[PDB]
């Protein structure tokens, strides 16, 4: 048991790597997207802004027209440590991407709604002058 633990747990330290390494792989796909999506939402936000503009004009037109075993076991830890730093790297990129976009969602939701109203009002004045 004594050795079945100083080695088995040692295998866990070795595994402790792929465990925190597979996490990076899982983090990459996330970050890679969070970044890709970040730029996407930029062109997406343009939509809420593009519509925000046109609607103003559209409304006006509708208004104008409407009217050594332990030595290694100690090293593996250092390995985990070096990787722990990485976990911080992603934790920040993921964090700064989350907070920057959440607030972006706010602006999107705002303008999107603001324009929704203009569409409804215009749709109630246009539907009548149909055909």
């Amino acid at each position: 048991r004594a050795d079945q633990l100083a080695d088995e747990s040692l295998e866990s330290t070795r595994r402790m790597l792929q465990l925190v390494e597979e996490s990076k792989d899982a983090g990459i796909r996330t970050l890679v997207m969070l970044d890709e999506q970040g730029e996407q939402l930029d062109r997406v936000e343009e939509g809420m802004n593009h519509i925000n503009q046109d609607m103003k004009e559209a409304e006006k037109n509708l208004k104008d027209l409407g009217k050594a075993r332990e030595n290694e076991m100690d090293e593996n830890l250092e390995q985990v440590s070096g990787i722990i730093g990485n976990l911080r790297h992603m934790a920040l990129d993921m964090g700064n991407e989350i907070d920057t976009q959440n607030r972006q969602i706010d602006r999107i939701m705002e303008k999107a709604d603001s324009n929704k109203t203009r569409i409804d009002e215009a749709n109630q004045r246009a539907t009548k002058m149909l055909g």
Binding site: M16, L41, V44, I51, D54, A58
Partner: protein, 66 residues
């Protein structure tokens, strides 16, 4: 010295333990973020396109007054 060798193991496992679970989270993570990634691919679609629907409307309205 035995005592230190046994106490060592005790702390090592308690460590090994906390580890395995943290790994469990990323697994579920990659399954969540991805499930959300597809929920945005349609957004970008419905957005830049809505810009076309609105653009076509604002254009027709202008050429309906001049």
């Amino acid at each position: 010295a035995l005592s230190e060798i046994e106490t060592r193991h005790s702390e090592i496992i308690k460590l090994e333990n906390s580890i395995r679970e943290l790994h469990d989270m990323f697994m579920d993570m990659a399954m969540l973020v991805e499930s959300q990634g597809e929920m945005i691919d349609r957004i970008e679609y419905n957005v830049e396109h809505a810009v076309d629907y609105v653009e076509r409307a604002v254009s027709d309205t202008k050429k309906a007054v001049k």
